[PDB]
From a paper:
Proteomics and knock-out mutants reveal that the narrow pilus consists of a previously unknown pilin, which we name [name]. In contrast, the narrow pilus has a zigzag-like appearance in projection, owing to a 15 Å wide groove that winds through the filament. The diameter at any position along the long axis of the filament is therefore only 45 Å. The glycosylation loop in [name] spans amino acids 54–71, with amino acids 62 to 65 forming a one-turn helix. The C-terminal β-sheet is composed of five strands, one more than observed in PilA4. A disulphide bond is formed between Cys60 in the glycosylation loop and Cys88 in the third β-strand. In contrast, [name] has a total of 2 negative charges per subunit which leads to a patch of negative charge winding around the filament. In contrast, [name] contains a single intermolecular salt bridge—between Glu68 (subunit A) and Arg23 (subunit D). Supported by our curvature analysis, narrow pili comprised of [name] appear to be more flexible than those comprised of PilA4. We determine two functions for [name]: it forms the main structure of the narrow T4P and is a requirement for cell motility.
Type IV pili (T4P) are flexible extracellular protein filaments found on many bacteria. They form multifunctional fibres involved in twitching motility, adhesion, immune evasion, bacteriophage infection, virulence and colony formation. Pilins have a conserved N-terminal α-helix, with a 4–5 stranded antiparallel β-sheet at the C-terminus. The α-helix forms the core of the filament, while the globular β-sheet head domain is solvent exposed and subject to post-translational modification.
Numbering used by the authors:
A (entry chain A), B (entry chain F), C (entry chain B), D (entry chain C), E (entry chain E), F (entry chain G), ...: 1 to 111
The structure:
């Protein structure tokens, strides 16, 4: 390594470490409301399929039979990963999807 | 494409592929019993119109003259698409409508 | 057409094609005996009018002169429509009315 | 509306628009001959009542005095609605009932 | 999957899951009163046919002989599916049709 | 930007651009036959309503008075958007619905 | 939910919400004139039965004794549901049936 | 950092910042017409359910009782998020759905 | 080269080889789970397109017809590069995507 | 300059010109396959945006409207610098990206 | 110092000041185009992050919120050291990065 | 040693100790700013690698896991030799590299 | 040679052998640490080039492929002259450069 | 000159011509290897500068453009004085510096 | 002084003034080329130090700031004694050292 | 001793004491400037060795550690015999050698 070589490296490093570089903006909250919409779209469709199967106002278990990509337990379908609890309450007649703070309550006739 | 951009895409894809999505529940069997009822409703009406035309117990051909949205052959009116064979037998005095397994036999005086 | 609309139509069709609906009971034979009585009532009256005209035991042609609503031929008054042949035989001294199987023979002095 | 929901609606619409459905057979001509008989039955009865009132062969006006459910004019009783003109001609000694093509001429002694 | 593609999907999902979507209103009770009327219409007609057959006040068994689309047992015609029990009581002289709460009692002379 | 950072981006881009990604399958032809069925279902219903209004075999203009979501012209109801020409011909006694190649001819008594 | 999936849903929704769909034409007024005829047919028959019972011109109460499917009060038989008031006036010698605007006055000898 | 390392980074950056990268095309207007169709599909269905409930031409409030995923106020159902005002006017006999410029007017008999 | 020049190079080399320099962290496993999600997102969409094409529960071959950027063989779509085997088994009714250890099983009705 | 000073410089030069020094490994070919992937990722996204704009299978010009950082000509989008010709052929239904030997052909429905 | 010692120094100096010695080639212009590329890479990424935050076409201020290693003023992000002015103009819909003569204009939808 | 020899040495020493000879200019401060740039370049890269590992905003310990050629302690990575303390403060959201007076503060989202 | 000449030489030799004359300070150890730094700088760069070639964590042989000015044997690159053994051990994940006592161990992920 | 003076000169000359006096050791060969190292150090640096200029593997003429203190001819840079021929051969990919027997071959990628 | 003593002095003087005695060979010209080399060696080093200070191509005044043992004036560093004018000309890009006829021109980038 | 012998000695002494005989010219001042140059040459070299040892600007004690042939005291190296005081002053940044009137001040960076 000569003296002149390092001098030229000092020049180049000054330029090449003097650039715009973007940072990690956390956009989970943005995607969570997108997720909770997309889930809520399926919950409507699943309910509409349950009504053809049940030929009447379907039960909350019959509604969660239709969605896939996540398991059920009692009366709360959660996604494959532990989020998006679409919890209903047949007495109240309403589903409520909630990814991670961002939520979306929808009211359908369940018994 | 920067490193930080892909990192943010890895975050978003995790969320947006973690939703309820409904599946194709086959509800043909449900609609077939609805079809075979709706057809059987018309077969009653068609028979009642045949009785005014014939001024008496009408023949099985006179009964299939009245329904539309499907062709006849001998003594079996089938729908436009090949289903819903409302087959009678004048000796037995009964029509029998059958969409695709789901069926509905009705007994009227035919000669 | 939405999914929910057809589901509701499937419910309604099940109910509205689940009713009592009466059938064509052939009651011609019942009316034929009623007809042959009503005709026989007139044949008595017509004979009684013939006796005042003829001032004696009337001929079989004089008796069929009185009834109306049907033509004569030789010695058999038939109705307007081809039924109810009230045929007499002056040698046997008896009329016989017959609509369509159901019959009613009456014996009066004819020459 | 999800993609899967419409796909299921496409299946159901195919089935539920594939049924026998009866058509309007025009049976006026059938009922017109029934009407003209029922009217002709009353014209006989009305004439028989006129003969007790008149104590003799009754006039054509005296005969139309008895029927109801329709007005007279000169010598033609028409029904409430403009049909069923039972027109007589006392010179010819015959009534003729005519609903709408289907007719029934009856011959009684009128003066 | 690029970052910009998911961003556009987040926009579209917001719009396409923001629509009116109708719910399953249970209209069985509406159709039950329609059913019980349509059945009661047939029970009148069947009784009127029984009176021509019986030439008098008909028995309760003779009345249920005429309707079709459902079986009898003792003195209660039920529809094909277990509903619409048109039960009479010859001592009380009245039929009573009842689909599923919605009912229609009619009083005819039965022996 | 260091050398090692780009090397890691080269690794990630290889993986993240190596996925299944679905393509636009044109399913208009599928929906056109679904449309032409749904339209044909309404044309039947509209005709049945026209028969109650007209108390007889209705005219082709009276039939197109009932459907909505599209304009008429002479004797061809087209949808709001220029498709689904349900064209009749009263002389031939048949309607014919046609979305965009996929068609459905139905024959009812029109004058 | 991928971008391509929603794009295909946008195509399908355009087609499936572009159909003829019939509207509720109010045909009560049509059925009211049919009702008031059918009621008026029974009022004639009931009067004819009253004349055999009374062996003479029957009273207005004796005439309303015969019809069923509705109650009486003073001198006005109304149907089970509050409509179709067949009101007579023995002084005027005429019944008048009126469902709901559509009416039918008939004149018979009542005392 | 050696001189040769930066030289190689200068080569790589030239290549890796020389790619196609897609831009955000605003497709709200596309989805708004899809939304306003999907909403208009439900408004038809909701009206058809209102007609079974009301057993007649339903009121504008009865029609907005059926849709879900958004609130009402007076006579204008808006979606959960402030868009898609399906405003009717019972005097004019027409609903009008409007997402955000893209609109869809439909005419049904409302009182 | 003077003595003083090398002395100054000895000073500079000490400083310029005394810096933080990042190392290659292997983030394939991170991208593999991102890949297997993105692939699984497409497999859902492709299945939903297959259901519109097949108008029913689609076959496993019809589902792999839709994805692009990789070839099929028998019943296993692999990516362009040999990874991401989305293997189904129609008897078991489930797809399973697997990039390179990181996997994602999804259950849809396949025949 | 003394004799001893140069002797010490002869010692130092021997050591300081006896080091590992890395060479320019040409890694363009490595970055070209990374480039052609990153470009191909955008071509997929751009096509998916074209499908929402075109509401159907988009033209090859509509697809190249979306990418940026390079110009188009006829039917070949090239980057800002003359490389990465993503050339399609609508008849063949396939794009082909090629940086500089390293290439990546992808098949989408273009018209 | 002897005579012979200096004579030997005269020999050595002749050799040791007879070598290749490299000169300072100014390679700022080379690094400036590398810088302006690396900055332009970040400006793309920052814009793509702004689109997820803004859920739409982002403003020019929202885009400069994401890059780091330099300050903003009005509508021109400059690096920490006074160079690399990535100046946009929302009316023209294009960013332009310029290190020091070497520049790179990129066109994205900004409002 | 002769007199003439020393006289010649006196001449030569006058010339050979009459030359330009360069001095030690301390250029540590120059290299320190070059060092603190090169370190700051790695701190950016290390942070970008931490974001892929952490799939989110990474912790300050996860960021110092990636750089090499120096040890950590608590929350301050120092070089192998005791200099270049890149100290962060997760509460303040900023790293600060400092070789020996010459410093470089950079602000990234750390938690 | 005269007496006075030697006397003057005795004077001059006293002065000219009474000077500062510098000694050979052994500065190999100083240059060895400079060498081992300069070598270690190249070993970092060579590793960073190996990572682009290998597209992953490179092998120890791939790393020694890049440096020049010295030969390899098994897993130890030595300089042209027998010194500066940069020996790695892939199991331990660390290179160690050692000129001649003065050493410099660096830890990078090698397999 | 006295006798005693010369006698004393004979004594002194004996002493003053009885001393150590060093001889000319030819140390060109020592300096030639020092020269050929110092030249080879510059040839490395010059090559590293050529790579930034050429942005790739530089030509042999571009490499000899950087060194100074000597002329070029075809493909052999010689020093100002006719020695130190650093001759390359781009086909063989290696420079070779040679002062005067003592040589130093170095292998770099030249084209 | 005896006769014999002088005779012996005559003998000795003959011998002692019959010796080789060296002459003053002027070797300034030899040392001037050695000087102008040693000065030129420093001018190279001083320029290399100026490039680290200036972080770029240094000015001619910055280059003469580094050498010592002589004063400057305008743009010509002369030694302490008036010789060795290393005169540059920034426009021509070359220094020229000249002791006293013997000269040495060297070409470096000066501004 | 004869008379003639002394006469001949008188002749010879006249000749032999009639010669050029050189005198002692004091040339200390000439050698002192030669000494102070030779010492100053070593002081430069010693300083250059101190800079490699100290790896920076060396102290005045470190500089006098290198010369030999004379002792030090505090900050003034004197020769073996008491002359040639090379006295520095670190605050002033300059050495000054002085043999015996004839002096030579040189300015180097000392601390």
């Amino acid at each position: 390594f000569t003296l002149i070589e390092l001098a030229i490296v000092i020049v180049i490093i000054g330029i090449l470490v003097a650039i715009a570089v973007p940072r990690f903006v956390d956009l989970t909250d943005q995607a969570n409301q997108a997720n909770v919409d997309a889930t809520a779209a399926a919950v409507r469709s699943a309910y509409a399929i349950a009504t053809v199967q049940a030929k009447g106002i379907p039960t909350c278990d019959q509604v969660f039979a239709n969605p896939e990509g996540g398991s059920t337990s009692g009366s709360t379908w959660t996604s494959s990963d532990n989020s998006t609890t679409v919890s209903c309450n047949a007495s109240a007649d309403t589903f409520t999807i909630s990814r991670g703070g961002k939520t979306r309550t929808l009211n359908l006739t369940v018994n």
